[PDB]
Structures are given as structure tokens and as C-alpha cells.
Amino acid sequence: RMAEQQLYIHGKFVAATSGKTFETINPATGEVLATVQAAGREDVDRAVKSAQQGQKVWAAMSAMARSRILRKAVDILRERNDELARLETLDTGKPLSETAAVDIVTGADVLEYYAGLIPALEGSQIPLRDSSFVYTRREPLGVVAGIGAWNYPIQIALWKSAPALAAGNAMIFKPSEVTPLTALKLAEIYREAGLPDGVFNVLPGIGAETGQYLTEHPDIAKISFTGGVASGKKVMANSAASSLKEVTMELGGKSPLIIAEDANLDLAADIAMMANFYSSGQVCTNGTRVFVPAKFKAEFEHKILERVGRIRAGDLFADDTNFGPLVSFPHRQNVLRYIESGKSEGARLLCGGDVLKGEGFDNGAWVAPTVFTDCTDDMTIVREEIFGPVMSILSYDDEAEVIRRANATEYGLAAGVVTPDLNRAHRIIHQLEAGICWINSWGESPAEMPVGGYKHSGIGRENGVMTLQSYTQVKSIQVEMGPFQSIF
Amino acid sequence: RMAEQQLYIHGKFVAATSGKTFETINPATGEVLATVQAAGREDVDRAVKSAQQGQKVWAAMSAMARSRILRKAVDILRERNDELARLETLDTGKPLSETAAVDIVTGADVLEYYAGLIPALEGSQIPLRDSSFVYTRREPLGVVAGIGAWNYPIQIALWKSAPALAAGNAMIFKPSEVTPLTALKLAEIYREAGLPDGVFNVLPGIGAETGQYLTEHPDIAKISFTGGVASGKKVMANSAASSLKEVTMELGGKSPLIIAEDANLDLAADIAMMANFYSSGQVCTNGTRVFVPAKFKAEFEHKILERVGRIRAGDLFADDTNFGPLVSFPHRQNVLRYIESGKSEGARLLCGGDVLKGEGFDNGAWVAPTVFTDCTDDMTIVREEIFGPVMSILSYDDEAEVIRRANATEYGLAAGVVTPDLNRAHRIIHQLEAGICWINSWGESPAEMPVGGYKHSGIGRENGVMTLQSYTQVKSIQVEMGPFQSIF
Amino acid sequence: MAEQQLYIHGKFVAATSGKTFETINPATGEVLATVQAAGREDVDRAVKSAQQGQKVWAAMSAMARSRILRKAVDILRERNDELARLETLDTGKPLSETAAVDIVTGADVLEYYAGLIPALEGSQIPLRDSSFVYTRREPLGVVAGIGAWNYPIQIALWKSAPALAAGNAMIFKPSEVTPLTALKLAEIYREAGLPDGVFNVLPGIGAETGQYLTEHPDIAKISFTGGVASGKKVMANSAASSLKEVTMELGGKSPLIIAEDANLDLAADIAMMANFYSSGQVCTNGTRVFVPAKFKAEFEHKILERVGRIRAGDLFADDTNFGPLVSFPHRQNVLRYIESGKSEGARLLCGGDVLKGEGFDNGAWVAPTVFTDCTDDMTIVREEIFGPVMSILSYDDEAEVIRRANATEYGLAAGVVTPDLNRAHRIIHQLEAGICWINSWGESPAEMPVGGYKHSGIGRENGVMTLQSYTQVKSIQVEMGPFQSIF
Amino acid sequence: RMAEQQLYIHGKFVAATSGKTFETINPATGEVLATVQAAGREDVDRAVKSAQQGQKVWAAMSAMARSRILRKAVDILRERNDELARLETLDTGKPLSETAAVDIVTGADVLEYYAGLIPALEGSQIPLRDSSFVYTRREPLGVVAGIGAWNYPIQIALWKSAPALAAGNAMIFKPSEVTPLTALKLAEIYREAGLPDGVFNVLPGIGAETGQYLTEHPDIAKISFTGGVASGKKVMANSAASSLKEVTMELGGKSPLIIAEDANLDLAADIAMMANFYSSGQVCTNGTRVFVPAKFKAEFEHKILERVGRIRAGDLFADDTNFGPLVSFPHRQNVLRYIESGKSEGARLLCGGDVLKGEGFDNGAWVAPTVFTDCTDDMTIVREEIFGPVMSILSYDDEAEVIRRANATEYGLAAGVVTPDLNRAHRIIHQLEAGICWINSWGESPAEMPVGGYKHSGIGRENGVMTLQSYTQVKSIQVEMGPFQSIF
Ligand SMILES: CC(C)(COP(=O)(O)OP(=O)(O)OC[C@H]1O[C@@H](n2cnc3c(N)ncnc32)[C@H](O)[C@@H]1OP(=O)(O)O)[C@@H](O)C(=O)NCCC(=O)NCCS
Ligand SMILES: CC(C)(COP(=O)(O)OP(=O)(O)OC[C@H]1O[C@@H](n2cnc3c(N)ncnc32)[C@H](O)[C@@H]1OP(=O)(O)O)[C@@H](O)C(=O)NCCC(=O)NCCS
Numbered sequence A, B, D: 001r002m003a004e005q006q007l008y009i010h011g012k013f014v015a016a017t018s019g020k021t022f023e024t025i026n027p028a029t030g031e032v033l034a035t036v037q038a039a040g041r042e043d044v045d046r047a048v049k050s051a052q053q054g055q056k057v058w059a060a061m062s063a064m065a066r067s068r069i070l071r072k073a074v075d076i077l078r079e080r081n082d083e084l085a086r087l088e089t090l091d092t093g094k095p096l097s098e099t100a101a102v103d104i105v106t107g108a109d110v111l112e113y114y115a116g117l118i119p120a121l122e123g124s125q126i127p128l129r130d131s132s133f134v135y136t137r138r139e140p141l142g143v144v145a146g147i148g149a150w151n152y153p154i155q156i157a158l159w160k161s162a163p164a165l166a167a168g169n170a171m172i173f174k175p176s177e178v179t180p181l182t183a184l185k186l187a188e189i190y191r192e193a194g195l196p197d198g199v200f201n202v203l204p205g206i207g208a209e210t211g212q213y214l215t216e217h218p219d220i221a222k223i224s225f226t227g228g229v230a231s232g233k234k235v236m237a238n239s240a241a242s243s244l245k246e247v248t249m250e251l252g253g254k255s256p257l258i259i260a261e262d263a264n265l266d267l268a269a270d271i272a273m274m275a276n277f278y279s280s281g282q283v284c285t286n287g288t289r290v291f292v293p294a295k296f297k298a299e300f301e302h303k304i305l306e307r308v309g310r311i312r313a314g315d316l317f318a319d320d321t322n323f324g325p326l327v328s329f330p331h332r333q334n335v336l337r338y339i340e341s342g343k344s345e346g347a348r349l350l351c352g353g354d355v356l357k358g359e360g361f362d363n364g365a366w367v368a369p370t371v372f373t374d375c376t377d378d379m380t381i382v383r384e385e386i387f388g389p390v391m392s393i394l395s396y397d398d399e400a401e402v403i404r405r406a407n408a409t410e411y412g413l414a415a416g417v418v419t420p421d422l423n424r425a426h427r428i429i430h431q432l433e434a435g436i437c438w439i440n441s442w443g444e445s446p447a448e449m450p451v452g453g454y455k456h457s458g459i460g461r462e463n464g465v466m467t468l469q470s471y472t473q474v475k476s477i478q479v480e481m482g483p484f485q486s487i488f
Numbered sequence C: 001m002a003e004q005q006l007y008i009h010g011k012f013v014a015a016t017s018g019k020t021f022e023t024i025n026p027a028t029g030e031v032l033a034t035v036q037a038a039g040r041e042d043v044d045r046a047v048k049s050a051q052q053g054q055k056v057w058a059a060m061s062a063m064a065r066s067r068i069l070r071k072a073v074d075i076l077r078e079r080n081d082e083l084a085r086l087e088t089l090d091t092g093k094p095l096s097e098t099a100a101v102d103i104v105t106g107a108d109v110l111e112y113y114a115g116l117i118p119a120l121e122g123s124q125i126p127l128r129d130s131s132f133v134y135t136r137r138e139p140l141g142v143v144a145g146i147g148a149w150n151y152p153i154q155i156a157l158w159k160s161a162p163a164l165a166a167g168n169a170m171i172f173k174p175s176e177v178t179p180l181t182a183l184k185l186a187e188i189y190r191e192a193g194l195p196d197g198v199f200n201v202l203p204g205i206g207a208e209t210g211q212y213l214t215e216h217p218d219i220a221k222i223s224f225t226g227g228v229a230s231g232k233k234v235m236a237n238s239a240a241s242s243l244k245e246v247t248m249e250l251g252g253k254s255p256l257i258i259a260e261d262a263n264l265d266l267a268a269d270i271a272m273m274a275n276f277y278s279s280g281q282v283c284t285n286g287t288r289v290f291v292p293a294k295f296k297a298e299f300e301h302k303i304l305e306r307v308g309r310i311r312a313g314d315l316f317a318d319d320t321n322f323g324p325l326v327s328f329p330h331r332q333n334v335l336r337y338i339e340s341g342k343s344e345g346a347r348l349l350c351g352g353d354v355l356k357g358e359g360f361d362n363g364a365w366v367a368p369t370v371f372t373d374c375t376d377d378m379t380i381v382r383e384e385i386f387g388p389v390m391s392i393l394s395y396d397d398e399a400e401v402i403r404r405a406n407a408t409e410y411g412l413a414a415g416v417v418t419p420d421l422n423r424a425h426r427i428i429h430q431l432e433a434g435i436c437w438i439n440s441w442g443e444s445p446a447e448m449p450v451g452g453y454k455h456s457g458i459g460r461e462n463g464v465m466t467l468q469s470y471t472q473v474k475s476i477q478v479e480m481g482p483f484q485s486i487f
């Protein structure tokens, strides 16, 4: 066990005044990775006053000065990629083959992107008449709060903190209690790059206490939350009741992958695998409802089974391992309950469905890669996000039907279609009710591409130019050079 | 009186199935203007199903076809300006001198503005590599809901419905129970202009029921609310708990008006008058904290007294009337309680402070134009929105001090400065924490200018190009033309 | 008809040149009208009129300008058929085209820009707490447009709409071949409430009236539509005189690529519309049709079947879809190109000569003409003909067709016909042209910027960007801090 | 002495095949700094084929890959700032107090700015109907040519190459024959940073041969030229006559500085000094027509003379030197002809008017700081750009008059106003016909700010986001998914 992990406030680690702690577990062994201090209500207020002071220094700097500091943070992240990836693997259970190639790399890509856009953040000017004009400023919100999830801890912290800092704000970040460690490292890296004290503070803790203290604080102007649909509704509600904060929410999904009647089934099966079993199924954007034409279903199932057999579970630091345990043991239990629900409702188990057993698996929160077929739109596993390695295969007959069924859900995060046909690809995608759409691929989320959910899957967007703007507030200023007329 | 007012669903007036009605009162005479049907839970569901069907027709039209229909609505509104203004006066008690020059004129201006921008609504295209690119669509939200306030009934209905419809949505509008009449007229006008049935439905009712049914409905994608700060928090919370709706909120303020030491005091007094006594003080953006340099306070007070003496209360249809009663007797009661708190807390009454009495006033909720001076930052009348004709005059000594005090509030809607000095005007305005800032003027809200609140005064914005975009949602589409690679 | 005058400051006025020219009806050979030609003094009058009007125009509110342009739109829709008939007499294009395309799409662009006027915005850039920058998009002032003869009224609208919408006054010179509809537009604009001087029309000869505009010191921009060679001279003269901003929409030799998986009925329909509309007198025409060798014979048969359905005749008849060429001198140039095709070894698939008989002997008719077995070195393949002459070329592989499609000084338009998702985007992204069509040809939405690569143009028309290109940026720095001198 | 300077083509120095050379002179001593090879027609053809090959490599990289390479060039330029400034001082005669603080600093600022914007370069997407949409690409022009001037050699090379390279083009740069040395250093710096071979080639030579050969070449897509008005017309003409190239031109001016009646005259005099005598008056944007109110003329003249007396000419590497010789002896002769016309036409000489003589000046191209007053709008020195240290003071009586006179010129590059009054500052500036306007300052040209001329002072702009886009060409693409209809 590491030394007791402290809070990060105003450029330094600092002891919590709450008197409370929590533990993070290595999901591959069950051992305690570390004891972590939990931020109390007084700790949150202290972090906010620190952030207010830092934000004023940060915002008073020039745009290019802020860009240079974020770019130095990028360089440090690239250099420390493997060290951070290893820590992320210990905390999350994700294979090093993933964490060393994706988590920090794509997190730093977004920070690098926004570092370069700071000088392009511009207001507007509007002429009204010769004697009057309007101009606008895109001003910082002030102090914002980001609340992270556990599947991509450092990536999420970068995707929230990068636009927030680039827009001139200070952010107080609360990582998930499951995976608090990499965010504390990120805080040191930012300071090492020259970020002014207070601009990025990290408050580990529990959602019911630390997260709620942030959502309630009167001087925080915005909350950005990544997490579950149910917890999101609570965060957004508490954020409104306290001080009417601006809100961004990235929640889960039940995204459909539509295989067209002209699709090559090797390509479709490869896309379905990457849409379901990367990060052991713990990805909000996963294509967990795979729609396949009835005439192809039997062949597609065989192609899925062959590729499931190639999945290589084992030591998370081994080069060939491409599948890990789930993030925690309680989470494994929920995934298993969904699997039992699939059996009890009559879905046909094609493969998996149980924990992994044997030396190297008995002490980890492993679930076998699991595929259900003969699925129907009313089944619990088809309707609800599992956030585990569980693919649901559904047969369909015609294009209009599959679009209706793909859209008949409260979720709206992602979608995809597999087809070589120009007209079919655009025609279908334009009709799907989702914010993130992939044609003949899955999963790639470039820094330039806004991503977020329709309907219950989210509020607002992340990434792209628009997210830099959404971390500012517009001030309109009218200059009246004419004589003002009063009717009184 | 008038005929019983029904609901407007799918291009026709229709009876409510709630079995409930309410009365709208003429605030100048006390007479029942009309009996109005109240939309029940089932009526809201009918309106949503109507809106869904109409929205599909609307969105499938070409952009210019939508533009032309809204422009026909503009032309009808210009032709009926005076008739609609007189109706607005009957329902609100605001003088015809105001309604015939502002309410419909500026409401129709915003509709004309967005009508012309529909064809300019564009997504983006982002090249990733030779073998892949991303493009974005700005898609309609679907069915959205507007909830109006009673001070500017038809203007609010136009400022919400114009961008929502121009963005390809259908809107269900709930007017305030105080002032439902003009919204029903607007619904007929839209139909007459060629708006497809269902695209604009109007559901009169009470906030506790009809408003709550809209915030709760699972198939409404966005709520846009104008009203008080307190009611706003309830709407925003209920929108999250039910279906995680996008939300826009335009709430009240306690906006500061800063008179600089080099200001001409006749101009300052004229601006203060217009910032406090228009629409009898029932304006969210009013400059109700008037900061005057200590050395000019006495002279400024004299100039206010002289201009207050010229305010002309009387017949609301006479050209020289420039002051009306408050919208209801309960609202006047609240304004009178604030005036009494001002007296009891030691503020000096400069003028007014009582109800108006005599023939032509006894049946209306009239309050005299009221000015308090010798005010301090801790007084109730200085800290809280009154929404009545009550100006608070505060003295200050230096620029840094006045900026602090101007910003030391939870409200953030508007602000202004009076100064002929180039540096002082821009320098002060840039430090003020408000979304709407006026230099040497007050009140003008051009269609091009985004307007909305900082902090507790609002979420999001109205008007400007950005509000058109905010009634769309982004879908990002990646076209991957290279061979997809699975790691499994 | 009545002797046609110049239009300056809201009225018809006699030219001071003492010179006139005649415009010929291309279907009968008869003189339609005698038109006065603007001299150097007339241009100076138009410019001073424009300077006075532009100030009135620019001082109005943005929405005031929008309403006036929208009222011109309403007048244009109501007089569509009348304007179309005049266009047919002057151009020779069938009424089936002029009543459905010329005024409709010209008015579409005017309607489009009318609505964007209030969205024209500058920027604001903070530098530090004590200094910021804001920009204005200011009118250029007086700008000049020089039209072509194939789409007289449409081109006048596509140039004047963004110019006026941006707050400028425009002096428009129509082609001497086709001056009549531009003068009608001038009246319509005035009837809509456009202030006097904001749109002046100066008919005349390119060698005189055009050159006087390109040389005038108080004109800030020249916008020219025409041939590549004429464009180079206009742009040079605009530079040598007063360093004007320039926009040029010139000709092309645009390629139409038929893919190996293309449906040949669709390909043939696209090739027909890309070659024989307006009798082949369209700058964006796909006059190089690349077809896979394995499909060439079938494609040739399908083209011939559709050429036989072409209906030449009375231009005011509903079923007529093919007209004479705009002038007899132009037909002479088109016939010389056809003879080179014959002499250089291209195989004549149909047409190749003038049309004869009652109703055709007195008009400047050329039959729909198709060459095949063409090679990249032939004159008919390398140079814009601007007549109804399709060249069919065979190809074997994708890389080859892209190299050959791009192997030209022209850069205006291009297209591909394919149902395959990857092939359509992949090929289009590599073609060196500004206007690219997938599984279609010819559509030019008001929202879509259009213009040429390489020798086919400078700048763009239509879309939001063209509104901005008719403004000039002024950057303004507000320095609220103390200024420090090193002296 | 330095080594014979060669051409830079495809990542290496290479001998010209023209057989021709020229010499660059140290303007402070008259000595030969270096012999420089002159590129002939064949060398130009080779550089274009090099550029075509390099441009393909550069454009096929990712946007962030291009961004990183330019950022490494920024880092090298910052580290080598003093060495580069010293070389520029030797080649131009500008004091090191200027070159080490401005030339490379602001040149590198612009490269840094555009490096970060590469990922934000985006096309558009326009929906037409359900069955068809349009998207646009911002494609590189290909090979572009920059032709520099001699007053700010390395800065001009950076301001032209930075947006051109950031947009994916290759640039062939021709420096002025007066000042070729720093451009060749920049080429090595770009290669050291990782710029692919051929993307930045430098061809020293004469305008009549090397300049003309580039403007004529069929495979160069755009010309960007900085220089005199007369040469500009010739460049723009040859660019059109050959292959109809896109053009950008930054030419000279006769920019007005308007001192208002309420201006502080010390501030006005400091601004006029910086607007006339920086770089010895060899700045295109200089405020050489100084309009002063008649009532303040005498006092303003006194304050100018006092500040002129502080000008410190001397050793160009000494810290306190703030005034240098002119760039060449032929240019001094032209400046002297203008000064003589000022005397002969009746303008009153307040100071200067002759060369500087004595030890340390006799071998340099020195002209004394010169001020004329009692100037009138018809004088040659008032109407024509001198590009030397010659200020013209003009008296005026009222605002309308000074605006007319300020605008009564074929030039349009810059302008400025000195006034503390809010209304006067914006009101006057909005009426001036110039692309670059300064209020209460002069000379600052932020990377974010587009700069360029009205009328004869230029075509197009430099700096700002718009200049990155102007180095691309728009391709519009319509996808028609519905059945195509032929009328034949
Ligand atoms: C561990 C597990 C229980 C999820 O944790 P949870 O307690 O349900 O919380 P959520 O993931 O919904 O919310 C994310 C974060 O919101 C915050 N949060 C929760 N309740 C909060 C509240 N009332 N106020 C403020 N913040 C709160 C916490 O920081 C939480 O981090 P956590 O994941 O460690 O709890 C897991 O078994 C699970 O259900 N995961 C499936 C998917 C999911 O619900 N969310 C993950 C991303 S979609
Ligand atoms: C520039 C030139 C080549 C144009 O060739 P062209 O297009 O065959 O010539 P045209 O006279 O038909 O010009 C076409 C259009 O440009 C117009 N035009 C010609 N000169 C113009 C000018 N200086 N300004 C404006 N418009 C001009 C013509 O009026 C005509 O308009 P319209 O036909 O639409 O009514 C020709 O005008 C010229 O100057 N010839 C001398 C050089 C030459 O022939 N080529 C040298 C080859 S090495």
C-alpha cells in the first residue's frame, strides 16, 4: 500500500480536514492499492478559494502564454506515458496494451489540440447603425468542477480540464472513488508545466459527499459530469437547486451497430468485436446492440465465435494480453446479474456467461467475453446498459425496421453502420438519433470531433472547437454614441 | 368580455380534456377578460404527439421554404401590430405607448432575423487523413417547450419560438396564466402563414400543473423558461429528474448602473429613469442599483425627483400615458412589502412609496414610482429583485470600490456605465459580471445580440446566431474509407 | 423594340458615347434592339452616381437592406415568365429552360443573401486587460460586375446580390450579345426600393465599356465571368490601373468520370445533362466523359438513344429542349472545333453539322455532336468549345483516370458516377476542381461556394464566403494602457 | 566576410545555374557583407519541382504532425533570436535595439499562432434535402511563392511562410536583393525542425529575373508580394497574364495620424515619434501625415522637436542606439530628392533635411530625422510615400475636414486617432478608409489581427484566422443520393 494519498490544493498536496478515507483496490488481485483522503465540505470551500485566486492570474496572462504552459504539460505527458499507463492499469484493470497506447495518448491529444486553439478564441462585432455598435467577449466562467468516471480516469480528466483551462477557467476535479490515483499525478504534472497554483485542484472523495459538495457550492459556475444516467439526473438536479450552474453530462448508452445486407461479414464481425470487448466492455460508446440481417445471422454468429476465441486474457502487463478484469468486484456482480437476466428471459448464450477461473484469475474480477443471440427489443440486456463484456445480437429483415428499432430507446450516445454503399451509409446515419456515428468503423474520437449524447445519454458535448466555446460565457456590450432618449 | 379561450393543438382550437379553467383579469379595471381552458396531462401528451408529426413535415421542407413561411408570419405581425398591442395592454396593464412600439415590433424583429438565417445553418467537415474524414450535422432537437412570463407575453413567445422553429423544431408554448391571450393569437398567425399543423401548439394553464407536465414529459427534448430565479430552479431540477432535457433559463437580476465621475448628470438621470420605470418596473434587465459618485449624489437626486414628477399614469390607451399598474394585486402586494422593508431598514424615501388612489386607479394594482436613496449593500431592497418601480440610489467613492459592489451579488443579468471617457467605459464594462452590458444607454436588445445572465440570472442565451445553433444538436459522422483493423 | 438606353441613378439615360450596337435574335437573325453603348464619360457618371447611392444604402439598417432585396425577389418571381421570354429572345435558350432556371436560381441567390445581411459580423480579440482589437466588415464601396452572355439575368443576380447585400453599389456591364434582361433587373431593383445609384447598368462593348470599368480609379473590385483568355486580360488591366480586388468565374474542360460499377443509364443521363443543356453553353459542362473501356460500346449506344430524343424547334414551345447558339459568330467558332475533331482522328458518333430546314435556316443552330475514340492530345479534348460537343474517352484504371482528369490548366468542375461509398469520396478528394458532383451534375445551390482551380477562376461565388469577399476587413486596436515611446 | 551564399532547394544549399551573382552591402559601412548567387529560370523550375514533391509529403501528414514541426521551428527561432537579430542588423542597418526585440520575436509569434490553428482548419456541411447534402474541403493551393521586401526581411518571410505552410502548401520564397541573408537561415531552421525537403525553398535574386520568373511560372498557384505600390501593379499583372494566379499584396501607404482637440499633446507627440522614426522611417504603416488642430500646432511642434533631439544615432549594436542608417545608398538618394521637394515647394523645415556626416556616419546611408510643418495637401511629400524619416505636420480646423483630408488619397494602409473621448475615437475611426487603425497607439500588429490595405495599399490580408483560410482553396462537393432526372 502506498502512502496515504492527500488532496491537491493550490499547487501542493495537503491533508484533508474531513477525517475520512477510502481505499482503491487492484481489480486483478483484490489488494489495496492505496488509502485515499476524502475532501470534506471545508476542504471544498478551501479548494474553491484557491481556484478563484489562480483563475485570476491565469486569465490575466496572454493567450499564447497559456498555450505554452499547456503545451509543456503535453510534453511531460508524452514523456511519462508508460509510467502513467502502468499506474492506470493497476487502478482500472485495463491491459497495458490499451493504457499505454490510448489513455494518456488521447488525453494528451485533446490537451495539445486546445493549447493551440486558445489564440483563436474570439468574440464578435455587430454594427447596428453609424452611431452604435455591439461587440461580444467570450469570458471565462470562473471556477468550474469536473467529476470523473472510472473507465478512462486520466483521459476523462484531460478531456474536461483541457478545454476548461484553455478557456481561462480554473477547474476543481473530483476523480471517481474507484480510480483516484492518476488524477493526482496529473495535478503535479500541470504544476510542473507552470500552471498557476489553484487552477487545477484535485479532490478525491465519494459522490454522496465530495461530489455533492461541489455541485452545491455557490461559487462554482459549471459542473461537467461523466457517469451513469441515474447519477447524472441527481447531479444535474442538485446543481440547479443550489446555484443554477451550467451543466455538461456525458452518460452511458445502448448504441446500435447496424450491419447492412450488403456488408462484408468479416469486416462487420471485426467492428462488432471492437465495439464490445475493448476495455472489457467498459466503454460508454460501445455498440452493444448488433443488428444483423436474418439471412446473415448464422454466418455472423460463427464469425463472432471464432474471434471471441482469439481473445487473450492474462497478466495485464504482458504484451499479448488484450482483455482485462472489470474495474471492481461490485461491478462484476452487477454484470453477472445482467447475464443471469439474459438467461432467465430466454436469450441464447452463444459464448461466455461466467467468471474466469484458474491460477491468475481467481483473485481478479474477471468476466468471460459474453455473447447473447436471438435477442429481442424488450429484453433487459437489450434495453439497459450493462457496461460489461456482453454483446447482444438482434436479427432484422428490412432497413426501415432496423432504423425504428435502433432509435426506439431513451439512450442516444453512439451508433454505426457497416455498408459499402454510398447512399445507404449516409441515408441510414442521417436517420439515427445519436451524437456519435461511425461508418465502417468504431471507436475513434478525434480531438476535433464533438462527442456527446442525444436524449438521456447527455447534455452538451466534449471535444471540438465548440467545447472550448462552451467553457466561456458570452458578454454582449453595446456602445451607444448617440444621444440617449428617455420617454420620461 | 371575449369568447372562451381554448387550447391550440394541431392547427386548430380544441377543448381541454382536463375539465379545468381559469380567468385572466384586466389589471387596469379588474374585469374578467376571458375564461381560459387549462391543459391537463392528457392534453400535453396530445400536444406532444401533434408536435412530433408536425416537426417531421417541417424539418423535411427546404431551408428557404421554412424561411418564407416565417417571413409571412412576420408580415402578418407587422400589419396587426396595433391590434395585438392593444390586446397585450388589456392583458398586462402596460401602456399602449409601450406595447405598440416595442412588444410586437421587437418580437417580430427576432422572427424576421432568424427567418433569414435558416439557410446559413451549417455543419462542419474535418479531414483526418486521406482515408477518413468527419462531417457534422446540426439536427433539430425534435419537440421543445417554451414557458413564458407575463411581463412581455408575445415578445417572449416570439423570442423562444422563432429560433426553435427556424432550427427545424416544433415548439409547445405555455404562456403565463396571467397573460395567455396574445400567445393564442400568435398560434393562429403562424398557421395563417403556412406553418404546418402541430409545429406551434399553445397550452394555457397553471405553472403547478401544465408547466410541470411539460417539464416531465419523456418526449420533449428541451425546455426554455423565462421567469423568476426561484421558479427557475424548480423547472431546471424537474427537467433533469424526468428525462435529462436541455435547458435554457432567462431569470431576473439586480443589475447595476454605474454613473462615472465625468458623466453628464442629465444623461445619467435619463438612463436611470428608463432603467427603472419602463413597463412600471416589471423588467428583468432593469438597472435597480444606481451607483452615483458621492460628490454628485445630491444633484443626481434632484434630477431624479424632477423626472419622476413627469411620469404620467392614466388611461392606458392615451398617447401621453407612460406608466401603468402592476400586473396583479398579489404582485403589487409584494412590491409594497419591499417598500416597507426599505423604510424600516433606514433607507431614505426620496419619492413615491404608496398605492395610487382615486377615480381610474382604485380598480387597478397601481403603485407610485418610488426612489430610495442613502442605500447600503446589506438592505433587502438592494439585494433582492423587486420587479416593481423601485430605484435604489447608492453612493461610491472610487472605481475599484464600485466594481466590487456591482459584482457582489448572486444575480448577473445586465449592467451599464455612463461615462464619455473611452478607457473608463471599456475598462469598467470588461470587469462587470453580467451578460448584457450597456454603455451610455439602457434596454436595447437587438436581434443580433446574444442576451442572458451570469450566475443565478440564467442558463444559456437568447437571440444572436448562437441561439439558432443552441436549438440544434450536433451529430458527428466519421467516414472511414480505410480497412478497419481489430486487435482481436 | 424601343432603343435601349443606359441605366444610371434610377432612370434610363442617353449614352454620351454617340455609339450604339445591335443585339441579334439567334433564332431568326433579326435585330432585336439597338442599344446605346457607355463611353468613358458614362462610366464616370455611373461611378459618381454609385458613390452617392452607396452611402445612402450603407447607412440603412441591415434589416432595411434585407427587406428591399426580398421585395426585389417577390417582383422577380411574379415576372418570371415575362423575364424568361425576353431572355429566350436574346439568348436562344428554350423557354423550357429560361422560365424554370434562369430567373428562379438567380432569385434564389438574391433571396439567400437578403437573409444573411444581419448575420454579417466582425470579430473581437482580447490582447490583455488594457487592450483589445475589434474588426469591421466594411463595404468595398463601388464594385463592378461584367457578365457573360449564356446566363444574362442569373449572372447579374449572382454578382449583384452579394455585392448589394454587403452594402456596396454595383455597376453592371452585361455582355453586348445579351444586354436586355440586365436593364429590366435595374428597373425591378428600383421598384423594390433600392436607392438610386446602387445598381447601374452600362451596356456596351467589352473593348470599351468593360475596359473603362477595369481602369476607373474609384472602383474597388471587378467581378468577371467569361472565357479564360478574356479573364487574364481583365485581371491584368484591373491590376495595372488601380490595384482592384478581383473575382473571376471562367471556363473549364470539366471531367465526368464513370466508374466501373456505375449504372450506365444513370451515367448516360448525367452525361447528357452535363453536355447539352443550354445547347452546351455552360461553363461547368462535363465535356470530357471518361468511360471504362469495357463499358464504352454500351455507353455510346445509350448516349445515341438519348441524343435522338433531343427536340429542337420553336423556342417558345413546351416540348422544345434544345436551342440555337447565342450568335452566328459563336457558331463559326464551334464549327471550327468540330472540324478539328474530324481532322484529328476522333470518331463522329452523331451530329457534327448545322441544322437545316424551315425554322432552322435562319437560326444559329448546331446539331448535338458527340465524338468518341478521343485521345488527350486532341484540340476538341483540350480546349473549351462552349458548344454542344461531347468527347468520350476510354480508360482502364482508377489512377489513370484521375491523372488524366487532372492533366489540364482548367479547374472548374468535375464529377464521378459510382454507388460505392469509398470510391465516390476517394476519387472526388483527388480531383483538382472547385465544384464536384457525385451521381449528379449541374446543381448550384445558393449555399454552395462555386469557382475554379488553376486557370478556371479566382475567388468564389455563392455561399456565406462570397458575402464576406464583398466586404473588406478593418482591424481596430483600442489601447487603454499608457503608450510607451523609445524616443 | 561570409561565405558565398547559395540557393536553398530541397533541404540543402545548392549552386545556382544562372552564372550570376550579386552583393549585399552593410549599410553602416558600405562594405560587402556577402556575394549571393542569383536564381535563373532553370533554378526556378527546379525549385518548383522540389516544392511539388515536398508539398505532397507535407499535406499527407496529419494536422497535428504539421503543427508540431512548426512549433519546433518556433523554439529554434526563440533560442537563436539574438544571433538572427545581429545578422538582420548587419543586412538592413536597423538598430539591434529593434531587431532583437521585434523582428524575430513577432515573426515567430505569427508562426507559433498558425501552428496551433492547423487542427481548426475546417470545411463545412450543408444539408439540401433528405436525399442530398453538400460538404466542402479547404484544400492546399499547392506551391505558392512569397516575394519579400527589405525593411523586415525575416519577419516578412515568417508572415508569408507560416500561414502558407500551416495550410498545407509549399512556399518558394524570394527575399529582397538588398537583404537576402536571414531568409536563408530560416530555411535551415525549418529543416532542422523537421520540415520536409522542398516545402520551404529560398531563391535569392533580382526582381526583374528571379521575381518575374516566379510570377510567370505555370505551376505556382498563388503569389504573395510585399513591396512598393508601383512594383505591386507589375507583379499582379504578370501573375494574371501567365496562369491567373491568386494574389496577395502588402504595399506602402501615406497613413494619417489624427490628433484630436482633446488629446494630451505629450501622448500625441510620443505616438507621432513612434509612427515616423522607427526603423528610420522605413515602415509601410508609418503615420507620415500628422494632422494637428490649428490651436495646438505650435505646442505640438515644440514637443516633437524636443523628442527628435533625444534620438540616438550611432553604433547599431549599442543598447542606447535607437536610430540607424537607411537600407542602401540608392534609397537614401530617393529620400533626399523628396526632402528637397519639400523645401522647394514651400514646406517649412523644422529639423533635419540632410545626411549625417562625421566619423561613424560618412560611410553609412544616414539621413537625419526630418520634420516639415505648414504642409498642404498638394505637396509631393504629403502625397507620396517617402519610406524615410520624414514627418509632415498638417493643421486642421474641424473633424469633418480632417476626415475628408485623411481619406483623400489613393493609399489605404493604416490610420490612427489620439483622443480620450469614447464617441470621438470610434466615430472617427469608423469613417477612415484604411485596413489597420490604431486608437491611442501605433505600430502593434498582433498575430490574431488581420492587417492589409484599402485601395492602392493592398489586396488581401496577412495574420488572423482569415489568412490561414486564404492559403487554401474551397472544393464544394454535392452528394446526390436521390434518382437523377434528365430532361433528355
Ligand atoms: C461502480 C459502479 C456502481 C458505478 O458507480 P456509481 O456509484 O453508480 O456512480 P456513477 O458511475 O453512476 O457516477 C460516476 C461518478 O459520479 C459521482 N457521483 C455519484 N453520485 C453523486 C452525487 N450524488 N453527487 C455528486 N457526484 C456523484 C461519483 O464521483 C461517481 O464516481 P464512481 O463511479 O466512483 O461512483 C458500477 O458498478 C456501475 O454501475 N457502472 C456501470 C456504468 C455506470 O453507472 N457509470 C459508469 C460510466 S457510464
Ligand atoms: C483577351 C482575348 C484573347 C479574349 O479572347 P476572346 O474571348 O476570343 O475574345 P472576345 O473579344 O470574344 O472576348 C470575350 C468577351 O470579353 C469581352 N472583353 C474583351 N476585352 C475586354 C476588356 N478589355 N475588358 C472587358 N471585357 C472585355 C468581350 O466584349 C466579350 O464579351 P462577350 O463576348 O461576353 O460579349 C482578346 O480579347 C484579345 O485581346 N486578343 C489579343 C490577344 C490574343 O488574341 N491572344 C494571344 C495568343 S498568343
Ligand SMILES: [Cl-]
Pocket: D082, D083, D084, D086
Ligand atoms: Cl551571434
